[PDB]
Amino acid sequence: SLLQFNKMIKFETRKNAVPFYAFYGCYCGWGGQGRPKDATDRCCFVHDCCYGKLAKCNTKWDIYRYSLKSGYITCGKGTWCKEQICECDRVAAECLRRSLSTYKNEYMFYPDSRCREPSETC
Amino acid sequence: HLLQFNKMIKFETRKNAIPFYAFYGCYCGWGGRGRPKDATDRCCFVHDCCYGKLAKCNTKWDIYPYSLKSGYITCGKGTWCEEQICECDRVAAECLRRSLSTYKYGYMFYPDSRCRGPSETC
Amino acid sequence: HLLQFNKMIKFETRKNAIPFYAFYGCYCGWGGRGRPKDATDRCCFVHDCCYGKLAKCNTKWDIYPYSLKSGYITCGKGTWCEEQICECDRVAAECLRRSLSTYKYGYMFYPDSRCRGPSETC
Amino acid sequence: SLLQFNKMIKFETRKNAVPFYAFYGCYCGWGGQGRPKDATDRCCFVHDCCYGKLAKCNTKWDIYRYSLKSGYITCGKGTWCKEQICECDRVAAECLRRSLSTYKNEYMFYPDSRCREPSETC
Ligand SMILES: [Ca+2]
Ligand SMILES: [Ca+2]
Numbered sequence: 001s002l003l004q005f006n007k008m009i010k011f012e013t014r015k016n017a018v019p020f021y022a023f024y025g026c027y028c029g030w031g032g033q034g035r036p037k038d039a040t041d042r043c044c045f046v047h048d049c050c051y052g053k054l055a056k057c058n059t060k061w062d063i064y065r066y067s068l069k070s071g072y073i074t075c076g077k078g079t080w081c082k083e084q085i086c087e088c089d090r091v092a093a094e095c096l097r098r099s100l101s102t103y104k105n106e107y108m109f110y111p112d113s114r115c116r117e118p119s120e121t122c
Numbered sequence: 123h124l125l126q127f128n129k130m131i132k133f134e135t136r137k138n139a140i141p142f143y144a145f146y147g148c149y150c151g152w153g154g155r156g157r158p159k160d161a162t163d164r165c166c167f168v169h170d171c172c173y174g175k176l177a178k179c180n181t182k183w184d185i186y187p188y189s190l191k192s193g194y195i196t197c198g199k200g201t202w203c204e205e206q207i208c209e210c211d212r213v214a215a216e217c218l219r220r221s222l223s224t225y226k227y228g229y230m231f232y233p234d235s236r237c238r239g240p241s242e243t244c
Numbered sequence: 245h246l247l248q249f250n251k252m253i254k255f256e257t258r259k260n261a262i263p264f265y266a267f268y269g270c271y272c273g274w275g276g277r278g279r280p281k282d283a284t285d286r287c288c289f290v291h292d293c294c295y296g297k298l299a300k301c302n303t304k305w306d307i308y309p310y311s312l313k314s315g316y317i318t319c320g321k322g323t324w325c326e327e328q329i330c331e332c333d334r335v336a337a338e339c340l341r342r343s344l345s346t347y348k349y350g351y352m353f354y355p356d357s358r359c360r361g362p363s364e365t366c
Numbered sequence: 367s368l369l370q371f372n373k374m375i376k377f378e379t380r381k382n383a384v385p386f387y388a389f390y391g392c393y394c395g396w397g398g399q400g401r402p403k404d405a406t407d408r409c410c411f412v413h414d415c416c417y418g419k420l421a422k423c424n425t426k427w428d429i430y431r432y433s434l435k436s437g438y439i440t441c442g443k444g445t446w447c448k449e450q451i452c453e454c455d456r457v458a459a460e461c462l463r464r465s466l467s468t469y470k471n472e473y474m475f476y477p478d479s480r481c482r483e484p485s486e487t488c
Contacts, residue, residue, distance in 0.1 A: 001200050001201045001204065002185060002187070002200075016350060018185070018350075018352075018353065019349055019352055019353065020349065022123070022185055023125055029123075029125070029126065029185065030126060030185070030186070030187050030188050030189070030198070031126055031129040031130065031133070031188055031189070031190050032189070032190070032191065033133075033190050033191055048189070048191075051187065051198070052189075057199065058199045059199070060199075061198075061199035061200050063201075108349075109125070109263055112129060112132055112133075119191050122191075123353075124267070124353075125263065140262050141247065141389075141475055142475075145246075151274070152273075152274035152275070153274070180355060180357070182355075183353050183355055227385055227386065227471075227474070228382065230384075230385050231245075231246075231305050231384060231385065233302070233305065245388070245395075247389055247395070247475070248395065248396060248397055251395075251397040251478065252397065254478050255397070260478075307368060307383075307384070307388055307395070307396075308396070309368070309396045309417065310396050310397055311396070311397070311398075311414075311418075312397050312398070312399050313398070313399060313414075313418075313485060317397075320396075320417065320424070320427070321423075321424040321425070321426075321427035322367050322368075322427055323367045326367060
């Protein structure tokens with residue numbers, strides 16, 4: 001579930017995940033392959049890899065909890081997974097904020113033809 | 123989400139769901155009735171069925187996590203809904219790829235006219 | 245024919261019908277109900293209505309002749325149906341270009357199940 | 367109406383107009399612009415032009431009669447327009463036959479992007 005991630009994105013970018021992030025470049029929105037086009041796409045690529053290292057959580061992908069503490073998206077405490085999953089989303093949302101400087105609306109629904117490059121390993 | 127299913131279809135079949143699958147036969151396009159004309163159309167029939175058992179979910183817009191990096195479509199862990207939907211899509215995309223052999227361009231845009239009869243039960 | 249309509253739409257708005265219009269608001273999709281969320285969605289409302297007045301015509305698949313060569317969409321003379329359909333499509337494409345000013349990405353993938361309420365009559 | 371044309375196309379190329387010639391290149395399927403991509407597309411471009419010169423006839427674009435005489439699609443006698451429209455269709459159908467040597471299925475549903483060159487004048 002990305003309900004929490006989407007909320008983190010909204011908070012960091014002032015933009016709604018859908019469709020600004022849900023379908024951007026080669027990796028935002030999953031089904032990622034090839035090379036991330038820009039900084040924003042790289043955030044999704046990193047977010048993907050992050051989720052990828054949480055192999056231990058493929059048996060219970062817990063919905064986590066977080067709060068705004070001191071104006072910072074702050075992961076709550078719970079199962080290691082809640083925390084790691086939340087950490088992935090958190091790092092991603094913030095990354096997306098930093099990437100707002102190069103975000104290009106023209107990269108939404110980015111054609112998948114430019115994403116058939118050899119994929120970056122992670 | 124429809125767009126992810128479309129990406130899966132592109133990955134699996136190399137064809138854009140639109141226009142090669144979004145209107146194909148009796149069940150590929152929105153709605154659908156009658157009897158699947160061929161394997162491809164049956165793929166779509168099953169997919170209709172697969173979505174049919176998930177009324178509790180937003181089978182069309184729920185964004186689920188899935189991966190293609192591996193070289194094959196993998197549905198990521200998440201809510202029951204996000205997985206079941208992704209499963210439906212993964213299965214139908216794989217199915218379309220396995221039906222590429224008998225894909226007929228003639229069936230592309232097919233009238234709901236020659237798609238009438240005791241609509242095959244799911 | 246649907247694909248000709250989408251060509252008019254591209255010509256008029258510079259956006260591909262899919263995905264920018266094929267699922268916009270509560271009427272641009274392959275269904276439609278409730279109230280038009282905005283100008284753009286209203287164009288599709290009027291279009292459904294326009295098509296609705298052609299029950300005896302194959303509004304979705306009939307191929308009509310038209311020209312974009314003049315710099316503007318012109319429906320060629322043909323059967324009454326081809327003209328009525330083309331006219332519907334022409335008005336809708338133009339209506340969408342006139343509505344670009346208020347096109348909101350957030351309406352792109354609008355969930356049908358939500359915008360229920362009294363479906364506005366044609 | 368292209369009913370007669372489509373029959374002429376079927377007879378000349380053995381293929382159904384839809385979708386083989388209904389959405390090919392830049393000019394087959396109407397709404398054409400830019401430059402014909404190959405011989406097949408050039409046929410449609412010429413067919414389009416041919417209809418364009420059919421200035422007098424938009425007030426009464428009537429269905430013409432044609433027959434097979436000695437294995438040749440032969441326009442019947444009738445109003446000047448019946449004969450001109452028919453002659454346009456006849457030439458185009460034959461042209462498509464001859465263009466079969468270069469026909470490329472890949473050009474079906476040819477992308478719009480490739481058709482934004484300055485349109486070839488008639
Ligand atoms: Ca369907
Ligand atoms: Ca509709």
